Amino acid sequence: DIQMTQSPSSLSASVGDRVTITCRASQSVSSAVAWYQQKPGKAPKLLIYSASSLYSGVPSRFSGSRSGTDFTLTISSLQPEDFATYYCQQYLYYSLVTFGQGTKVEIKRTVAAPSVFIFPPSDSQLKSGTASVVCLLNNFYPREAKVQWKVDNALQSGNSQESVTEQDSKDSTYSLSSTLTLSKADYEKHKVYACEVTHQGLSSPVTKSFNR
Amino acid sequence: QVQLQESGGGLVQPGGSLRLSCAASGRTISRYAMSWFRQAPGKEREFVAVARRSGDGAFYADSVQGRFTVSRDDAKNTVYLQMNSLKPEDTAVYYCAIDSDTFYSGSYDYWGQGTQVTVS
Amino acid sequence: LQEVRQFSRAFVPIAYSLICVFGLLGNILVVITFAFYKKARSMTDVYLANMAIADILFALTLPFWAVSHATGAWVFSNATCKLLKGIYAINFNCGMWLLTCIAMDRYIAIVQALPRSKIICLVVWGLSVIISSSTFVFNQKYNTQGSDVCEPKYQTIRWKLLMLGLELLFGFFIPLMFMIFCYTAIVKTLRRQLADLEDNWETLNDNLKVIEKADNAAQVKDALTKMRAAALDAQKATPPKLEDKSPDSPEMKDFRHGFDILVGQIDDALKLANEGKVKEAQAAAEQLKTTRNAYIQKYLERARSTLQKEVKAIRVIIAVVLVFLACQIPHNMVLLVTAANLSEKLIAYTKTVTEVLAFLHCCLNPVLYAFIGQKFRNYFLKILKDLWC
Amino acid sequence: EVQLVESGGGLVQPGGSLRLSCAASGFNVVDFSLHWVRQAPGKGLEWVAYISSSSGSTSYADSVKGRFTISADTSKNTAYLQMNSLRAEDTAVYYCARWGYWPGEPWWKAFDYWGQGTLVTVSSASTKGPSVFPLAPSSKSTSGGTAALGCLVKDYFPEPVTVSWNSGALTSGVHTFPAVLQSSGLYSLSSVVTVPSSSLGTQTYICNVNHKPSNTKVDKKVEPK
Ligand SMILES: CC[C@@H](Nc1c(Nc2ccnc(C(=O)N(C)C)c2O)c(=O)c1=O)c1cc(C(C)C)co1
Ligand SMILES: O=C1CO[C@H](CNC(=O)C2(c3ccc(Cl)cc3)CC2)CN1C1Cc2ccccc2C1
Ligand SMILES: CC(C)CCC[C@@H](C)[C@H]1CC[C@H]2[C@@H]3CC=C4C[C@@H](O)CC[C@]4(C)[C@H]3CC[C@]12C
Predict the structure, then answer these.
(1) Residues C328, C181 within the same domain
(2) Strands, E assignment, C36-190
(3) Could you tell me the residue range of the domain that residue D165 belongs to?
(4) Which member of A87, A179, C248, C267 has the lowest number of beta carbons within 10 Å of its beta carbon?
(5) Which of C335, C338, C342, C359, when mutated, tests ligand 2's pocket best, judged by the most ligand atoms within 8 Å of its CB?
């Protein structure tokens, strides 16, 4: 019934920065809005209840406000231990609970271009009927990059499947791998396999390919 | 059918300053992302700074971190680039590019012509 | 023209004498009702009365103004010339600063939510004379066009002009900006509290009509969702009679407990409406009329009388501000543009028109307390009943 | 010391049945309403159902209505969630959270204490060992600089697989990607590493894929061609 709209779905910040996450309710939710913090692989933790009240054990940098149906979570000074996902939730009734979509707060970093590596499928794959080709994107910032799996100079959709790791512990960079799955006869139909990689740190796309 | 313009430039001493400009014609930069790019003699098409939507942040390259500042004005559809503390390695043509995809994938299809920034 | 300026010179002194006697009489009435009662006086009212005595001190000088305007020349000495022109200056900055601290007091008592009042009065009365020290030292009876007049003149460079501009900005632009900001925030605060009281009460009755004609459980849940949100917000409402009171007062705790029962009866009807029961959900919403008529409507009309009383109380001192900013504003703009620049009938006519406009203000303030005043009118009948015996 | 402990999350078939037993400690059931919020892998929090065992007011989300049944008992101070006719969309991490009764402060503390969660995997595939394949780097790919090589972990059904490099002696520049679910119901994983290109020869790079439910311990070799 009542929808919940969390606006800044990805947030990049550094240590000492001031953050602001805006949540908005579809109906009149009257200060019955809670805020939650969730580290990856862990249960959520309540930060702000009643749209402004600070929960016990939560440091004073976290704060909340309400302006009508608009709700706001603010971290004043951003410590390194509050890089997590943040959820808003209206709780007007027990059976009426709807959560926000979630905003993940990441470490701000200088822009690094991805290093593109393409790996041909080995002989052990083609002796089993499946041919997987992987385009590897190494050590880039920020997360948003697009991999186009141009097979035989043709745009492809449907069989490509990507995986993005988390932020690295040392240099705060992401890595990507976008494997493409095809049958053995469909692998032997074509010979030129390319992956085109666009990033905000790249003026032009980088195409790494090989010939079979 | 969308083209970009620019201004700024000139000869600057080391430790100086300069401000660029980049207006957009026939397009709204309200729901888009703006980028700046260098082109030095020897190393070409280098990233400088990006400017995303209001509240989506702004990001800077490794060489120009701290001494550069990108700004955005959605009403005039014009963005700016405040260069400070100019070393003599910043001499390049400064291009302005638009992110054609709203999900920040880095699809730079529309470009400007450039600003011939020269230092020493 | 000599005839038009002579018509103005004949219009000025009897209007001056009428304004002098009327402002003097109304101001003694305001003073005696301020002095004869202490248990009802307020801090904002302390300022209101200081502006009153200030216009008494102004009103004692209009015989001299009437005499000098009747003779057509400053029969008096230059000493008296500044004597009078300063009295008017301390009246102006006393009015401006007293209405400025009236605005701050009302901002504190409305937006943000006395034995030491005499020190505050002595501060404002002094600050007026300080901003009037330039008026005291810059005005001396001189001679122009064969006649002596009481008017200021910038003559024999940097100190005079600098301090003149500084004091001007500090007492006029700065306070006026504080006044318009504080009064706009007060009006926006009080009108929103009028809206938040009404729309929380509007949907607690309008959505009760949707429950009785829903004919299925789907509209009963959607109607009761809006009433649980309205009754939760209306429980959070702080009335102006409880704004100055403590948030943990026993008078507020009865008002909160009525909404602790009303939401629990929405919760009972929401529990029935999610089970598909439509007749039992409407019957559980019949008890929502019972609790509203015994807990909430008792506190609704008490809040709707106090909030509109505050709107009635804020509309007389803003009208006091607006009358003061309609009379005393164009005369000081005339006296500023004459010192700035150092046909011809229009300048002399607009000089005398604003001269009688700002001098009328000592009469217009007891007019406002008698007409739209809510404290002076009740206590003027109190002292009249105690004397007519 | 107030805590909620989930149990019973596991591996079921589509159309199957399982009961998640959210235990509790340090507090009783009839003074706190217990809710179920689930989180799909890679998705946000979604409310599922609630019970108020002081009265009995079991409501559900519209995606789980009829199939799900929440219950609780106060003698054991636990809660239960009986789920039937499960689909692939019910694969999630299921949290149980407590929320107080109106009126007062503990109603306003919505989901103040959570349980750590149990993962429910609804899938029709059976457990199989992974097929490890190397990702051999090319000679023309970054010659004389820094090269990337790795092993592809493919077609294993139970998700926890552990990949180490040179028996745990290589740690710099390893990117073990999270597993994705294929259209066939099995999981695939990539674990690449980056090394100097001068160390491509006279250096053994050992990929150690360890899969526990199928006791699979393939030790593949990644070498340039
Ligand atoms: C002009 C002098 C007159 N005062 C008057 C107003 N004052 C106030 C106006 C606005 N807000 C307040 C207020 O905020 N609070 C909290 C009460 C007032 O007090 C009128 O309106 C009015 O007339 C008065 C009163 C008395 C006796 C009580 C001694 C003698 O003269
Ligand atoms: O002769 C008179 C008659 O009372 C006047 C009362 N005004 C004031 O205290 C101030 C004021 C003046 C103009 C405006 Cl728009 C608003 C406020 C605060 C300074 C002062 N003067 C003089 C004329 C004049 C003009 C500008 C500066 C100083 C003086 C001295
Ligand atoms: C140019 C000449 C005439 C200026 C004269 C200024 C006189 C009228 C002013 C200067 C200081 C003023 C006083 C300052 C403070 C207070 C305390 C207050 O609780 C009552 C009024 C009272 C007692 C004022 C009365 C008027 C006052 C005495």
Answers:
(1) yes
(2) 142-144, 147-149
(3) 131-221
(4) C248
(5) C335
